[PDB]
């Protein structure tokens, strides 16, 4: 034997065929996950939980697929999520069909892959210009226009029944995080969920929702104007970096050691009372001795807080995190807090911090959600992340692309016209791209129960004469225009679907041989 | 809709079937033929070395030629079986150069290795070999000179051709006495009908090789020698040889015959009746005057007891292949009916003597000028030397066997392969195409036979080939390597000659064996 | 090609594995050579295709570089490790010709092994290779072409596109050509009293998957990958002359030296000693904030104790980063890297000369990753390249694709003489060595003639991966190069040929000057020298001895 | 070879939503037209079958 090698080596054309067949099976599972009528997929993790969703991102993430080429399709799920967050299912279905539809050849024609790759680069450039021409800009300051835009990703989810309520939650969440260009991030958006309740009763409340009850019974649970001060240091006695190792010669010295520990903590409490804060938040644990001197002055003590929540509290009340108690000043004390209350729920306590709402740092807010169970909460949270991500594209890119499969079909018509004018050796790889673009609107027909032969035939004919907004209706499975359909999708979602799918197909076409289990 | 649980995919081919396609499969098929060729490379040439092979039965067999070497080992890989078929086809048709055919068939695959690594598919490579093999055969017929043009003797023609096949064997030093045997063996056979079963050699353990003898008679050895033996004289003057296909026995191989006798007096008659039936056939043999009785089937005791008083020798249980060899030299043919035996069916000879060699007694027919058959009794220290000399004389008789049918003088010892290769290079210069590199590689592949001649001799093969191409520039023929004088020169003055069927069949078998494997790009093996 | 194994002799005994001698060793050396050779044959040339390797944990690696492929293959054969370490030596020194040196050295072993059976001695075979190599280098100096009458950077742009071929960036090589040339010219420095040298890896490679590869932005300055310590710090610095502080001193609560044991007889001293532990660190950060430093770089993590003053002073905090990355930041901005803060006097102080200067310091978020973009450096210019792709596995290939392009351009500006690529030199060295050795002849003529045909494996392999006819292209390369070797340097015509050929895209013979494919002369030299030592070391081995491990 | 390619060209037909019921009727009507056009293309009609 030699090294680590051989076993069964797959060489020749069958190595590329195995890469096309394996990658095609990835899009066949979520093939029914596209469209408003899309079904659901239940996943079983080794940890013992349950994941039920129609989003191809969460489906392909938990599923363990062992194969050199098929794993490359799994990585494309996080490409659409992390960059945008909407269209993860469309990219996998498109990239899965491109590899099969754009390169069936080399089984028959024996065309070299790089020759096909050179045609895919020119097809990607022309596909972007077609999308830019069919995209009509929309005003970002219109509240009525943003509601119908958020419902685009909602129409394919289960929250479409609440879509009238859901657009109210997504619009106020993105507008609050938006800072004046207009760069926002979801790290400050809270995913915290409330088990049980009515979905209509769920609302976005400014501030941070804490799960911890007040420490002492005499702590006021109702405050008109709370004043919040953040402390990273614990209120307990700090032992120090080096051991003290006090040598006690006389019996009076040992009692002074325990007496200073009470006075040393008291010294840190007197410096806090200078700004007389109504609510004191400590990142680490707190001693039961320090809470008394804080209660006498009106301060409130809370349980230890994680570092993630300390950043959101500082944004709501405008407070500045102060580690050193001696350096605490009135300038870093948070103000303009609307209400402080605690409501009783059987699972855990909940503490509410309301903002007075009236440029500066971006405000933070939490999204309260009332579901029917624990798993329903995780499904709507994934629906909100997909719906709120749509509002981020229109603000940075005011351009608005056609939805409902009209973007992919509009490109397929333009590629077929330029395929005969190009001629050359690249005409076959260039024309084959139009066949892979029409598979996405074809999926909408298969899920609706219509005839894709007669509908797609009239769709291409009415696309040239009628308008570029003609598309497939999800519910009725008929031929309608996106102008009267009332729902549109941003261009960033369509651009990421075309670019990621084509750039990933060129990677699998360059594979020659496959060797497994070389070493670790 | 599914039956239950999960359904795994069904593999097209049966589980355990090895199947691989592409250019990597042909390279694996060529390397299988080259690995087999590596064992037969040092065997080529008069200085070649023998190969010792032990099978799974621990049966020792030593053979220099590549025909028997490939028969001992069990070949598995399919492409390696192609070199075995050309070795057995060359052995049965001619029998000479069975090793050189494998060397040429494997060298063509070796020269095709750099062509397959290029963009040239194997279909265009076979076209160059099929075109070059047609011109190479026509060159041999043009270099053949008729022996009757010089009006030489026919006996000396077969002697020089027989000494060529004696090379690379153990006979090369002893060829003085041994060549004078096989040459006289083919002259006894009819020129119209030549048979390899009549020249069959018996294996006699012990003795010396130079102590062998050649007599136009035959030897049927012995089996039992029933009661009455060793009294009869083993030396006859002019005996009458008689052969019988009928078995002489008393109720032995005959089917069971139920005998029912209802009388006591009639029972005495049937007892003496069997004595009269057996002695009736024995009495009819004495009336013919036959001094030698032979039979294929065993001989009864009462038979030999009857001929014991008459000195007539009788030996049964002789194989059918030996009896068919006896009936040719004895004139008339076996009569299985004792009453139908006629005087003209009996044989004769000038002298008959039975002598014992190697603790075994053999009846030797002597003094038969009209005998059309022959026998060969070989001896030796080892029992493997006997099997080697027997196969050495077997391929040597095939030289003078094929020479009587067609008489053609063809050069040997690397002289023919170098002359044909240069004629192909001059023809390849006018091709101006893909076949130009293939014919030049085909002509270079024919040089492999002179390679092992110099490599096994200790001299460098680079300097010899350089002297050849400079010498072959001017018109020359029979020019080749000479081992005795250590200098390369004309082989026509060396008198070493070879038949034309060796070189013609070697080129056609090597091309046929090469184009067969190169045309297979995928190998499928089930089970 | 080895069958029946070998018969173990009882008269010859050695501890460990058996000893194999004779032609079986050289047959296994070529067999082990062709094993690693066939892997890089399909990956060579723009029409070539790379291979995939599984790490057994589910992760794979897709790269066209022959060095990484052979590095991931652990060869148990003793002579097989030479070709593996040959690829790691090729990209480390020259940085190009990694796939070619493996294929050239493989053909040298295949042809020489066939010559050993010809009875010519290996040292005579080695002598034939070294004498032919000495004259081959002299022919390389004759075909050198100095760049002249060229417009702008087109000389370096066309050469950089050659290394970009055969890799995923080859289709985008038109856009990536201007990014690589401008990257090495910004890091241009001076050393050896006037000699121009360039740093290796100085250009930062950031991996953010999204949008398209053609939209990758070239930052006019260095970029560092790190996350901000406190999210309350500003991510954008407005105004020019931004001061950057490069420091190796972390700000944290620290324990006193282990050789010190604190023993106190009074409880009253516990307040001042515990407070002074944090107060010693305050003296170092206080003088830095008063200097007006906008950005403070730190090699080690910083606790939240000292991050409070950075928020009030609007100073951006930094945590653990690569040590080699902070060196080029201080050199570009003018700052001086301080391993330990001290002055010649026994008193601590901070000088304004340790602060850098630039136009602005901004933190841009690419996908979910955040990185700092430093643009408009003062003292020395810098550059960075952010690679974008569909998945992280394509970005791993683009990194080695970009690193190989930086090594080719680096060797281009060191020697102005360049040679045409695309199998032009390998076809020219064949005919030059055919007329060679004809005067000496004798025995060495055969060993030298095989060395000329050994270089033909490179142009013939390129035509196989293109699914075209190789014999048609090889016959043309031998037609133009052969007749022009005897040309006399007047009446022109003649040598105007033989300078071009073997175009894999169109399958026709076209001029490489108008095509743009070129290769530095440094990549051609030292490639045959390293391939020769790999061939000489393996060919000289008659017997391999393996000892069983204890 | 012909029967294998008829299944390969049907890869696009089924992908477009064409049921296998109408596919059978497509090859049956095309096979009848193929056999009828083969007679007019024969220039090699020979009555000998002897020499």
Curated annotation (Swiss-Prot), chain A:
Gene assigned in the entry: CCT3
Entry keyword annotation includes Nucleotide-binding: yes
Domain of life: Eukaryota
GO cellular component: chaperonin-containing T-complex
Organism: Saccharomyces cerevisiae (strain ATCC 204508 / S288c) (Baker's yeast)
SS bond partners: 356-365
Keywords carried by this UniProt record: Acetylation, ATP-binding, Chaperone, Cytoplasm, Disulfide bond, Nucleotide-binding, Phosphoprotein
Intracellular or extracellular location(s): Cytoplasm
PANTHER family the record matches: CHAPERONIN (PTHR11353)
Subunit: Heterooligomeric complex of about 850 to 900 kDa that forms two stacked rings, 12 to 16 nm in diameter.
NCBIfam families documented for this protein: chap_CCT_gamma, thermosome_alpha, thermosome_beta
Upper lineage: Eukaryota, Fungi, Dikarya, Ascomycota, Saccharomycotina
Descriptive protein name: T-complex protein 1 subunit gamma
Pfam families for this protein: Cpn60_TCP1
GO biological process: chaperone mediated protein folding independent of cofactor; protein folding
From Swiss-Prot, chain B:
Family: Belongs to the TCP-1 chaperonin family.
Protein name: T-complex protein 1 subunit eta
Quaternary assembly: Heterooligomeric complex of about 850 to 900 kDa that forms two stacked rings, 12 to 16 nm in diameter.
Subcellular location: Cytoplasm
Pfam families per UniProt: Cpn60_TCP1
GO molecular function, one term: unfolded protein binding
Primary location class: cytoplasm
InterPro entries in the cross-refs: Chap_CCT_eta (IPR012720), Chaperone_TCP-1 (IPR017998), Chaperonin_TCP-1_CS (IPR002194), Cpn60/GroEL/TCP-1 (IPR002423), GroEL-like_apical_dom_sf (IPR027409), GROEL-like_equatorial_sf (IPR027413), TCP-1-like_intermed_sf (IPR027410), TCP-1_chaperonin (IPR053374)
Keywords for the protein's UniProt record, in alphabetical order: ATP-binding, Chaperone, Cytoplasm, Nucleotide-binding
A single Gene Ontology CC term: chaperonin-containing T-complex
Matching PROSITE patterns: TCP1_2 (PS00751), TCP1_3 (PS00995)
Curated annotation (Swiss-Prot), chain C:
Subcellular compartments: Cytoplasm
A cellular-component GO term for this protein: chaperonin-containing T-complex
Stated name of the protein: T-complex protein 1 subunit alpha
Quaternary assembly: Heterooligomeric complex of about 850 to 900 kDa that forms two stacked rings, 12 to 16 nm in diameter.
Keywords per UniProt: Acetylation, ATP-binding, Chaperone, Cytoplasm, Nucleotide-binding
First-listed, main subcellular location of the protein, grouped into a coarse class: cytoplasm
Cross-referenced InterPro entries: Chap_CCT_alpha, Chaperone_TCP-1, Chaperonin_TCP-1_CS, Cpn60/GroEL/TCP-1, GroEL-like_apical_dom_sf, GROEL-like_equatorial_sf, TCP-1-like_intermed_sf, TCP-1_chaperonin
SUPFAM superfamilies found in the cross-reference section: GroEL apical domain-like (SSF52029), GroEL equatorial domain-like (SSF48592), GroEL-intermediate domain like (SSF54849)
Record lineage: Eukaryota, Fungi, Dikarya, Ascomycota, Saccharomycotina
Protein's job: Molecular chaperone; assists the folding of proteins upon ATP hydrolysis. Known to play a role, in vitro, in the folding of actin and tubulin. In yeast may play a role in mitotic spindle formation.
GO BP, one annotated term: protein folding
Repressor as UniProt keyword: no
GO MF entries: ATP binding; ATP hydrolysis activity; ATP-dependent protein folding chaperone; unfolded protein binding
The family this protein is said to belong to: Belongs to the TCP-1 chaperonin family.
Modified residues (N-acetylserine): 2
From Swiss-Prot, chain D:
Sequence similarity: Belongs to the TCP-1 chaperonin family.
Portion held of the full protein: 105 to 155 of 568
Protein name per the record: T-complex protein 1 subunit theta
Role description: Molecular chaperone; assists the folding of proteins upon ATP hydrolysis. Known to play a role, in vitro, in the folding of actin and tubulin. In yeast may play a role in mitotic spindle formation.
Localization annotation: Cytoplasm
Subunit and interaction comment: Heterooligomeric complex of about 850 to 900 kDa that forms two stacked rings, 12 to 16 nm in diameter.
């Amino acid at each position: 034997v030699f090294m680590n090698a051989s076993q069964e080596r797959t060489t020749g054309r069958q190595a590329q065929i195995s890469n096309i067949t394996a990658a095609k099976a990835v899009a066949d599972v979520i093939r029914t996950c596209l469209g408003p009528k899309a079904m659901l997929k239940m996943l079983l993790d080794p940890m013992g939980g349950l994941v039920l969703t129609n989003d191809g991102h969460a489906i392909l993430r938990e599923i363990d697929v062992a194969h050199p080429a098929a794993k490359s399709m799994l990585e494309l799920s996080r490409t659409q999520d992390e960059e945008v967050g909407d269209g993860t299912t469309t990219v996998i279905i498109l990239a899965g069909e491109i590899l099969a539809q754009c390169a069936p050849y080399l089984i028959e024609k024996n065309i070299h892959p790089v020759i096909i790759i050179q045609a895919l680069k020119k097809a990607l450039t022309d596909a972007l210009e077609v999308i830019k021409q069919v995209s009509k800009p929309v005003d970002v300051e219109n509240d009525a226009a943003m509601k119908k835009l958020i419902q685009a990703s909602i129409g394919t989810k289960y929250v479409i029944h609440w879509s009238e309520k859901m657009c109210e939650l997504a619009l106020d969440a993105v507008k609050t995080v938006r800072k004046d260009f207009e760069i926002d991030i979801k790290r400050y958006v809270r995913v915290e969920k409330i088990p049980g309740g009515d979905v209509l009763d769920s609302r976005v409340l400014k501030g941070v929702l804490l799960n911890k009850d007040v420490v002492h019974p005499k702590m006021s649970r109702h405050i008109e104007n709370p004043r919040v001060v953040l402390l990273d240091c614990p209120l307990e006695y700090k032992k120090g970096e080096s051991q003290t190792n006090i040598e006690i010669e006389k019996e009076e010295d040992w009692n002074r050691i325990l007496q200073i520990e009470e006075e040393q903590v008291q010294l840190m409490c007197e410096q806090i009372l200078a700004v007389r804060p109504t609510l004191v938040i400590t990142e680490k644990g707190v001693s039961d001795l320090a809470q008394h001197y804080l209660l006498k002055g009106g301060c409130s003590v809370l349980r230890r807080v994680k570092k993630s929540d300390n950043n959101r509290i500082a944004r709501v009340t405008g407070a500045t995190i102060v580690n050193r108690v001696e350096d605490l000043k009135e300038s870093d004390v948070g103000t303009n807090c609307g209400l402080f209350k605690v409501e009783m729920i059987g699972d855990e306590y909940f503490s509410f911090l309301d903002n007075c709402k009236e440029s500066g740092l971006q405000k933070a807010c939490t999204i309260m959600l009332r579901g029917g169970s624990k798993d329903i909460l995780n499904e709507i949270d994934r629906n909100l992340q997909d719906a709120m991500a749509v509002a981020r594209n229109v603000m940075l890119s005011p351009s608005l692309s056609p939805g409902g499969g009209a973007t992919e079909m509009a490109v397929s018509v333009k590629l077929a016209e330029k395929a005969k004018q190009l001629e050359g050796i690249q005409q076959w790889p260039y024309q084959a791209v139009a066949d892979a673009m029409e598979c996405i609107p074809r999926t909408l027909i298969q899920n609706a129960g219509g005839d894709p032969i007669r509908l797609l035939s009239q769709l291409r004919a009415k696309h040239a004469q009628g308008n570029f907004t003609t598309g497939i209706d999800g519910d009725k499975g008929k031929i309608v225009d996106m102008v009267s359909y009332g729902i549109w999708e941003p261009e960033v979602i369509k651009q990421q679907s075309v670019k990621t799918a084509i750039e990933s197909a060129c990677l699998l076409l360059r594979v020659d041989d496959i060797v497994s289990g070389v070493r670790k | 809709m599914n039956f239950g649980s999960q359904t795994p995919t069904i593999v097209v081919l049966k589980e355990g079937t090895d199947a691989s396609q592409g250019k990597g499969q042909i390279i694996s098929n060529i390397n299988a033929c080259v690995a087999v060729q590596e064992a037969l490379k040092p065997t080529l040439g008069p200085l070649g070395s023998d190969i010792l092979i032990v099978t799974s039965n621990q049966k020792t067999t030593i053979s220099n030629d590549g025909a028997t070497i490939l028969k001992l080992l069990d070949v598995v890989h399919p492409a390696a079986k192609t070199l075995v078929d050309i070795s057995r086809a060359q052995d049965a048709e001619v029998g000479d150069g069975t090793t050189s055919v494998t060397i040429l068939a494997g060298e063509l695959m070796k020269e095709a290795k750099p062509f397959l690594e290029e963009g040239i598919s194997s279909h265009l490579i076979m076209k160059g070999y099929r075109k070059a093999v047609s011109l190479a055969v026509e060159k041999i017929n043009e270099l053949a000179v008729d022996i009757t043009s010089e009006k030489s003797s026919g006996r000396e023609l077969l002697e020089r051709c027989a000494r060529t096949a004696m090379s690379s064997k153990l006979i090369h030093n002893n060829a003085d006495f041994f060549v004078k045997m096989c040459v006289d063996a083919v002259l006894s056979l009819d020129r119209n009908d030549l048979d390899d079963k009549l020249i069959g050699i018996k294996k006699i353990p012990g003795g010396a090789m130079e102590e062998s003898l050649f007599i136009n008679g035959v030897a049927f050895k012995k089996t039992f020698s029933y009661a009455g033996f060793e009294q009869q004289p083993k030396k006859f003057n002019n005996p009458k040889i008689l052969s019988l296909n009928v078995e002489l026995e008393l109720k032995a191989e005959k089917d069971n015959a139920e005998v029912r006798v209802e009388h006591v007096e009639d029972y005495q008659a049937i007892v003496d009746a069997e004595w009269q039936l057996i002695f009736e056939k024995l009495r009819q043999v004495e009336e013919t005057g036959a001094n030698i009785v032979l039979s294929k089937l065993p001989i009864g005791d009462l038979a030999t007891q009857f001929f014991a008083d008459r000195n007539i020798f009788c030996a049964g249980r002789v194989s059918a292949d030996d009896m068919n060899r006896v009936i040719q030299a004895v004139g008339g043919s076996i009569q299985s009916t004792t009453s139908d035996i006629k005087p003209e069916h009996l044989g004769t000879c000038a002298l008959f003597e039975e002598m014992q060699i190697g603790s075994e007694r053999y009846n030797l027919f002597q003094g038969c000028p009209q005998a059309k058959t022959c026998t060969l009794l070989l001896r030796g220290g080892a029992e493997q030397v006997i099997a080697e000399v027997e196969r050495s004389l077997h391929d040597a008789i095939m030289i003078v066997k094929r020479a009587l049918q067609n008489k053609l003088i063809v050069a040997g010892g690397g002289a023919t392969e170098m002359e044909v290769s240069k004629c192909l290079r001059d023809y390849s210069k006018t091709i101006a195409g893909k076949q130009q590199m293939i014919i030049n590689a085909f002509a270079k592949a024919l040089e492999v036979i002179p390679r092992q001649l110099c490599e096994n001799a200790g001299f460098d093969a680079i300097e010899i080939l350089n002297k050849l191409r400079l010498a072959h520039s001017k018109g020359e023929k029979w020019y080749g390597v000479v081992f005795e004088t250590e200098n390369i020169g004309d082989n026509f003055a060396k008198f070493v000659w070879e038949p034309a069927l060796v070189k013609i069949n070697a080129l056609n078998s090597a091309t046929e064996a090469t184009n067969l494997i190169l045309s297979v790009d995928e190998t499928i093996t089930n089970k | 090609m080895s069958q029946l194994f070998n018969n173990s002799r009882s008269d010859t005994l050695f501890l460990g594995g058996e000893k194999i001698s004779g032609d079986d060793i050289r047959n296994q050396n070529v067999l082990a050579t062709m094993a690693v050779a066939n892997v890089v044959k399909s990956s060579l040339g723009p029409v070539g295709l790379d291979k995939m390797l599984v790490d057994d944990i589910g992760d794979f690696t897709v790269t066209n570089d022959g060095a990484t492929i052979l590095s991931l293959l652990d060869v148990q054969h003793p002579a097989g490790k030479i070709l593996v370490e040959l690829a790691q030596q090729q990209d480390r020194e020259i940085g190009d010709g990694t796939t070619s040196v493996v294929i050239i050295a493989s053909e040298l072993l295949k042809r020489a092994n066939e010559l050993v059976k010809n009875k010519i001695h290996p040292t005579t075979i080695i002598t034939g290779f070294r004498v032919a190599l000495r004259e081959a280098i002299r022919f390389i100096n004759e075909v050198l072409s100095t760049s002249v009458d060229t417009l702008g950077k087109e000389t370096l742009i066309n050469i950089a596109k050659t290394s970009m071929s055969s890799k995923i960036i080859g289709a985008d090589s038109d856009f990536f050509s201007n990014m690589v040339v401008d990257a090495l010219l910004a890091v241009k420095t001076q050393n050896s009293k006037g000699e121009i040298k360039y740093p290796v890896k100085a250009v930062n490679v950031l991996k953010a998957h999204g949008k398209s590869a053609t939209e990758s932005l070239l930052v006019p300055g260095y970029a560092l990958n790190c996350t901000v310590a406190s999210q309350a710090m500003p991510k954008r610095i407005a105004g020019g002359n931004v001061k950057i502080a490069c420091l190796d001193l972390n700000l944290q609560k620290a324990r006193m030296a282990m050789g010190v044991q604190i023993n106190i007889d009074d409880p009253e001293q516990l307040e001042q000693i515990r407070k002074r532990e944090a107060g010693i660190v305050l003296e170092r950060v206080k003088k830095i904030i008063d200097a007006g430093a906008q950005v403070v770089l730190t090699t080690k993590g910083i606790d939240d104790l000292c991050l409070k003053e950075f928020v009030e002073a609007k100073i951006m905090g930094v945590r653990r980063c690569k040590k080699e990355d902070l060196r080029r930041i201080a050199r570009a901005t003018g700052a001086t890297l301080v391993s330990s803060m001290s002055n010649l006097e026994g008193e601590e102080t901070f000088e304004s000369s340790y602060l850098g200067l630039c136009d602005e310091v901004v933190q841009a978020k690419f996908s979910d990753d955040e990185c700092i973009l430093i643009k408009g450096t003062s003292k020395h210019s810098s550059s960075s390249i952010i690679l974008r792709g569909a998945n992280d596995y394509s970005l791993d290939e683009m990194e080695r694709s970009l690193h190989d392009s930086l090594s080719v351009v680096k060797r281009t500006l060191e020697s102005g003489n360049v040679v045409p690529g695309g199998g032009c030199v390998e076809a020219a060295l064949n005919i030059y060595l055919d007329n060679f050795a004809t005067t000496v002849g004798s025995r060495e003529q055969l060993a030298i003639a095989e060395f000329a045909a050994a270089l033909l494996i490179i142009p013939k392999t390129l035509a196989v991966n293109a699914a075209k006819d190789s014999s048609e292209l090889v016959a043309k390369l031998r037609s133009y190069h052969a007749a022009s070797q005897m040309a006399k340097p007047e009446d022109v015509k003649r040598r105007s040929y033989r300078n071009y050929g073997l175009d894999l895209i169109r399958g026709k013979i076209v001029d490489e000057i108008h095509a743009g494919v070129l290769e530095p002369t440094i990549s051609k030299v030292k490639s045959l020298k390293s391939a020769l030592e790999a061939c000489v070391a393996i060919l000289r081995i008659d017997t391999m001895i393996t000892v069983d491990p204890e | 070879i012909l029967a294998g390619e008829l299944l390969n060209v049907s890869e696009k037909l089924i992908s477009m939503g064409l049921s296998a019921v109408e596919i059978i009727q497509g090859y049956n009507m095309a096979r009848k037209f193929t056999l009828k056009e083969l007679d007019e293309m024969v220039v090699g009609e020979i009555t000998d079958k002897n020499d």
